[PDB]
């Protein structure tokens, strides 16, 4: 059982309320671009600058929530508003990887049920 699958599951009725992997494409940018910065990194100590960094992606994700109604939907059924607060306090590279495969796999189903 894949917890990613069942929450995009239980979201159609068409998905997240006429949600489109278009309308993710600025959001799947921004983690891509963080999850090599990371990913290509030592410590698990994530550096100053890379916290900086996730808090922008943070304003993305409001901002684009309140551009698109489905990706407002999204991200709250998703719970990326919650835990992207809980990536950038513990501070940690071993988290933030497992929230950009969980965003992955999001979008993953998202896509396929599109």
């Given at each position: 059982m894949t917890f990613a699958h069942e929450v995009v599951k239980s979201n159609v009725k068409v998905l997240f309320n006429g949600l489109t992997t278009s309308k993710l494409r600025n959001l799947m940018e921004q983690v891509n671009r963080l999850y090599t910065i990371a990913f290509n990194?030592?410590?698990?100590?994530?550096?100053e600058e890379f916290i900086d960094e996730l808090e922008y992606l943070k304003i993305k994700f409001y901002y684009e929530a309140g551009r698109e109604k489905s990706v407002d939907e999204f991200l709250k059924k998703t719970l990326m508003f919650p835990i992207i607060d809980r990536v950038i306090k513990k501070e940690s590279k071993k988290f933030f990887l497992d929230y950009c495969k969980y965003f992955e796999a999001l979008v993953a189903y998202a896509k396929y049920y599109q």
């Open positions: 990194s030592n410590e698990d100590q994530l550096n």
